[PDB]
Write a protein that binds this ligand. Structure first.
Ligand SMILES: O=P(O)(O)O[C@H]1[C@@H](OP(=O)(O)O)[C@@H](OP(=O)(O)O)[C@@H](OP(=O)(O)O)[C@@H](OP(=O)(O)O)[C@H]1OP(=O)(O)O
Length: 309
């Protein structure tokens, strides 16, 4: 697929798709076609998300991942007897219509004895080219607040890893898994949020699209109390592995704190791989990393593997 790493993921998935039947087979073929260089995946990913969530919860007990069809049901889950730690994927909602509009995000949640803390990871941008994502995030914050969640215990972390919103379900799913794998670091962020604080926010918020808008307008444009920061400042390099942009990867590795500049593949591998090397390994053709499309192939394979053994 012009990319040997991607082609290997294509070849690994193909026989499962051949033996599969029904909607999941079609989903697999579409994903294969996409990785090969061949309609709207936000809707397709979302349709099959429950199956992948169900599988991943089994592969990694404690992941506690849920797909909610609206953030309304996230709020309901905060008012129930479930686990103290869980993750949620949900689409954004248009305030004027109640219509859900994809543009998914991942929320990592902690319940506390006896005022939850909530980290929302935004794989694209908080504000949006037509300020639509900002309005959708404000709706979530507004509803959280009205339900009794202090927004000072809520953070929206903007990573800008996604170049478009077409793959946001896959970024959100990947992000849920990474949040679980890095639960200790998330635990620490939640502890801060219990005290109404987010580390690095005093500098990091200004680096986000939200921060730019706040500085430009001198207006409060996000509901007061909620925190925001740029992904690289507060999250591990894990969250940038599927970043589309080669140049982003380059600049992230240039950061003085070196936090984005280490190994990104597991140690079991003979040769180490950093963020730029990974991006180039998944480069396809105007050039971008199709790594996230590889992640989708991996997830479908995991689902079909359960169905076929
Ligand atoms: O063992 P897991 O924690 O479930 O890791 C898997 C995978 O390994 P397996 O297919 O053997 O299970 C790769 O991880 P590596 O050991 O090769 O580093 C893979 O990486 P590639 O994308 O390069 O193929 C991918 O990881 P990722 O999302 O980090 O890119 C993924 O980890 P996830 O399940 O969290 O996606």
């Amino acid at each position: 697929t012009q990319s040997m790493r991607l082609q290997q993921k294509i070849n690994d998935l193909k026989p499962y798709v051949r033996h599969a039947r029904g909607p999941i087979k079609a989903y697999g073929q579409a994903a294969l076609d996409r990785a090969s260089g061949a309609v709207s995946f936000a809707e397709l990913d979302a349709t099959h998300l429950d199956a992948m969530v169900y599988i991943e919860n089994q592969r990694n007990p404690g992941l506690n991942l849920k797909h909610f069809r609206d953030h309304y049901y996230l709020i309901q889950a905060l008012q129930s007897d479930g686990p103290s730690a869980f993750r949620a994927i949900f689409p954004q909602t248009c305030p004027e219509t109640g219509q859900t509009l994809k543009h998914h995000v991942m929320a990592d949640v902690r319940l506390h004895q006896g005022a939850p803390t909530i980290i929302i990871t935004e794989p694209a941008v908080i504000v949006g080219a037509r300020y639509q994502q900002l309005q959708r995030h404000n709706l979530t914050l507004e509803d959280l607040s009205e339900s009794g969640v202090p927004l000072s215990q809520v953070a929206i972390i903007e990573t800008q890893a996604a170049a478009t919103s077409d793959d946001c379900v896959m970024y959100s799913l990947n992000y849920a898994i990474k949040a679980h794998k890095n639960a200790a670091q998330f635990d620490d962020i939640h502890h801060g949020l219990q005290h109404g604080t987010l580390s690095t926010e005093s500098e990091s918020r200004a680096r986000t699209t939200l921060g730019a808008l706040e500085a430009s307008s001198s207006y409060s444009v996000m509901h007061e109390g909620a925190h925001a920061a740029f992904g690289a400042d507060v999250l591990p390099v894990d969250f940038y592995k599927h970043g589309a942009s080669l140049t982003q990867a380059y600049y992230l590795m240039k950061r003085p704190d070196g936090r984005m500049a280490g190994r990104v593949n597991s140690e079991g591998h003979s040769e180490a791989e950093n963020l730029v090397q990974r991006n180039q390994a998944f480069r396809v053709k105007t050039q971008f990393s199709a790594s996230i499309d590889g992640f989708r192939l991996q997830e479908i394979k995991r689902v079909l593997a359960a169905a076929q053994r």
